[PDB]
Structure formats: C-alpha cells, structure tokens
Amino acid sequence: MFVTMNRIPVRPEYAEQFEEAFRQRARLVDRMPGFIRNLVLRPKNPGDPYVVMTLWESEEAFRAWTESPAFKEGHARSGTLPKEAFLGPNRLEAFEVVLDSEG
Amino acid sequence: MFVTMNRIPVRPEYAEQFEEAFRQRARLVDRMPGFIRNLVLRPKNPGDPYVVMTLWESEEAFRAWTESPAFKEGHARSGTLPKEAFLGPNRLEAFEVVLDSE
Ligand SMILES: [Zn+2]
Ligand SMILES: [Zn+2]
Ligand SMILES: [Zn+2]
Ligand SMILES: [Zn+2]
Ligand SMILES: [Zn+2]
Ligand SMILES: [Zn+2]
Ligand SMILES: [Zn+2]
Numbered sequence: 001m002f003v004t005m006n007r008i009p010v011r012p013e014y015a016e017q018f019e020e021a022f023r024q025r026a027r028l029v030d031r032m033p034g035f036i037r038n039l040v041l042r043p044k045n046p047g048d049p050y051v052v053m054t055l056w057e058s059e060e061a062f063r064a065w066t067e068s069p070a071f072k073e074g075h076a077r078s079g080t081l082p083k084e085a086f087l088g089p090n091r092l093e094a095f096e097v098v099l100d101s102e103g
Numbered sequence: 104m105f106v107t108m109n110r111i112p113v114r115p116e117y118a119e120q121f122e123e124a125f126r127q128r129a130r131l132v133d134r135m136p137g138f139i140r141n142l143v144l145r146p147k148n149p150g151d152p153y154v155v156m157t158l159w160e161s162e163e164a165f166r167a168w169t170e171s172p173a174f175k176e177g178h179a180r181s182g183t184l185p186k187e188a189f190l191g192p193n194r195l196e197a198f199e200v201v202l203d204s205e
Contacts (some may be wrong), residue, residue, distance in 0.1 A: 003144055005154070019201055026204055040202035043107055051108075051198060059147075095144035097156065098122055098130055102140050 001036065001097040002056045006090055008078075012046040015086035021081060022052065025074035029054070033072065034061025049091070059094070104139065104199035105159040109193055114150035115186030126157070128177035132157070135171065137164025152194075162197070177185045 012020045019040065027040045034057035041051040056062045078085070094103055113121045123144055132138050137160035144154040159165045168174055 003142075025203060030204065038202070039106075039200055040118070040205045041198035042201045044197040044199070048196065050194075053165070059133055066162070093151065093154075094147045096141055097144035098145045099126055101129070103132060 002059045002062055003095045003097060003098070004052075004053040004054045004062060005093045005095070006054075007049040007093065008052065008090045009049040009087040010081075010085055011087065014081060015042070015046070015050075017052065017080070018081060018085070021077040025052075025077055028070040028074040029065065032061070032065050032068070032098075034058060035065070042058070060095075104203070105165055105199060106154075106198045107157045107159070107163045107165060108196045108198070109155040110152040111155060111193050111197065112152040112190040113185075114188050114190060117185055118149065119147070120185050120188065121153065121181075122152070124181040127184075128180045131173040131177040132168065135164070135168050137161055138168070152190075158200075165188065165197075 008018070019042075022040050026040070029035050029038055036055035036057060038055070039053045041053060043050060054062075058064075111121065115201060121142065122145070129141060129143070139158035139160060141158075142156045144156060147155060157165070159168075
C-alpha cells in the first residue's frame with residue numbers, strides 16, 4: 001500500500017472554502033483504479049498545514065491517477081482558491097506502508 | 104475521528120532497527136479504548152522521516168492512552184532500544200478528520 005500526504009498551508013480564513021473545494025476532489029478519485037481511501041485532515045493548530053492523505057494499492061496506481069483527466073478536473077479546486085489563501089507551496093510526501101494494524 | 108502523526112527522523116542505517124522494534128510493541132495499543140488503527144509509513148526518500156499514524160475515536164482517547172501502563176511499557180521496548188539514530192527530535196502533529204471516503 002502506497003500513501004501520499006499533501007501538506008497544504010491554507011489560512012484559517014479559507015479553511016471552509018478549501019474543505020468545500022476538496023470535497024469535490026475526493027469525488028473524482030473514487031472510481032480510480034487502485035484507489036483505496038482519502039482523508040482530509042484539519043490541523044489542531046490553524047498555523048499548521050492541512051493534510052490530504054490518500055491510500056493507493058501501489059505507487060503505479062498513484063502515477064496513473066496523476067496523468068488522468070479526473071486529476072486535472074480535481075485541480076480546478078484551489079484554482080478557485082486565491083493565491084493569497086496559502087502561506088506557501090504545498091509539500092507532497094509519499095510512503096510505503098510497513099505495518100498496518102488492519103487486515 | 105482524531106489522528107496523530109509522529110514524524111520520526113531516523114537515519115537510514117537505523118531504519119530496519121526502528122521498524123522491527125516498533126513492530127515488537129505496536130500491539131500494545133490495540134486494546135485501548137477508542138483505538139481505531141495504526142500505520143507505520145516508510146518514506147520513499149530514505150532522507151525523510153518515517154510517520155507513525157494513529158486513528159482514534161477522540162482526542163481524549165489518545166490522551167488517555169499516553170497515560171496508560173501500556174504506553175510507558177511500550178516506550179521502553181522501542182523508545183530506548185535504538186541508540187541515537189536520529190537527525191533531530193520527533194515531531195507530533197495532530198488533526199481532526201473532516202472528510203473520509205470510507
Ligand atoms: Zn509507472
Ligand atoms: Zn510513468
Ligand atoms: Zn514511473
Ligand atoms: Zn505510467
Ligand atoms: Zn504515463
Ligand atoms: Zn496537486
Ligand atoms: Zn509512540
């Protein structure tokens with residue numbers, strides 16, 4: 001299982017719009033081959049970034065997704081969010097799951 | 104749902120020791136009230152930190168956990184086991200789940 005964490009430093013003033021916009025992105029990724037789960041995570045402290053965490057069957061499944069028309073439409077999101085909404089660029093992290101309490 | 108992520112900047116030479124030691128104690132949390140799931144995530148770049156991610160029914164369930172005998176007992180069979188194998192300190196980030204495809 002392959003996981004991405006997209007750290008998005010959205011200002012608290014725009015948190016609701018960000019969430020509303022990202023609800024749509026989760027919709028477009030649902031039918032995606034190898035998609036497992038998406039979570040949007042609000043930070044305890046508003047000065048820290050949101051995390052969009054996405055679970056995939058494999059890195060390859062993620063790569064296919066990045067090249068898809070669904071991904072491009074999903075990005076029509078913070079297309080609508082002004083540049084000013086963010087403190088900085090997003091920071092994308094990626095991982096392989098080494099232990100999972102589930103089965 | 105409440106999520107913690109503990110970012111562990113283990114050096115690559117000690118990553119195998121970290122993983123295997125965490126495995127030894129990872130089960131201690133399972134019986135805890137409000138525990139949902141735990142994942143240990145290895146970075147794609149060995150220069151980046153591991154993330155230990157845990158899903159909780161509430162923030163108070165997490166907090167109660169950190170007081171438990173099982174937490175103290177487990178943070179000796181991994182919290183002590185590896186030497187100084189780190190680029191710096193752990194960094195705990197906490198979150199509320201606001202969207203879940205599940
Ligand atoms: Zn490929
Ligand atoms: Zn390719
Ligand atoms: Zn490739
Ligand atoms: Zn490809
Ligand atoms: Zn391609
Ligand atoms: Zn993106
Ligand atoms: Zn711990």
